[PDB]
Design a protein around this ligand. Structure first.
Ligand SMILES: CC[C@@H](CNc1ncnc2[nH]cnc12)NC(=O)CCC1CCCCC1
Length: 167
């Protein structure tokens, strides 16, 4: 038993809700919140900008030190950093950005990072400003992640569409 509420159960291990991940994170305090990161951990907009804003820019400060030490992530890769006031940990995961020409097949590799964590609150990778089809992203999620994932979908219209078209 865990503390997530009002989720719809999609599969054995995937759940979905219409929620603001920032507000869900601050209420739940999950062990892991996933950020829709880029390779530079520049959290300027989308989910990343919203999560970073909710940390009062502490996420960005920590991220800049991470990059200065380690260099950029790989597309499809991840790193674990602090969750600040939102979660114990933040798993920064880089899905391919279609608006940058990156290969969509890397979306499966991105979701594989979730399997290193027993339970996660997450957005749909490569959705939103990353330019992928969120329905596709949901299919890859369901077919790749084996751990328990609670998907927060900000847009109510999108949430209805994803549920109604789910196979
Ligand atoms: C689907 C991925 C999410 C990722 N962004 C966030 N996801 C969760 N919580 C957040 N808080 C702040 N941002 C987010 N994007 C959207 O919902 C934008 C609207 C749709 C509608 C048109 C087609 C794609 C974009």
């Amino acid at each position: 038993v865990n503390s997530f509420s009002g989720y719809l159960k999609l599969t054995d291990n995937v759940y979905i809700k219409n929620a603001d991940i920032v507000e869900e994170a601050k209420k739940v305090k999950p062990t892991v919140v996933v950020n829709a990161a880029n390779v530079y951990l520049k959290h300027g907009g989308g989910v990343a900008g919203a999560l970073n804003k909710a940390t009062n820019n502490a996420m960005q400060v920590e991220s800049d030190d991470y990059i200065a030490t380690n260099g950029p992530l790989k597309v499809g890769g991840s790193c674990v950093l602090s969750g600040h006031n939102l979660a114990k940990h933040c798993l920064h995961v880089v899905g391919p950005n279609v608006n940058k020409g990156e290969d969509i097949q890397l979306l499966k590799s991105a979701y594989e990072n979730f399997n290193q964590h027993e339970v996660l609150l997450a957005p749909l990778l490569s959705a939103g400003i990353f330019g992928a089809d969120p329905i596709h992203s949901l299919r890859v999620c369901v077919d790749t992640v084996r751990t328990n994932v609670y998907l927060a979908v900000f847009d109510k219209n999108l949430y209805d569409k994803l549920v109604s078209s789910f196979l």
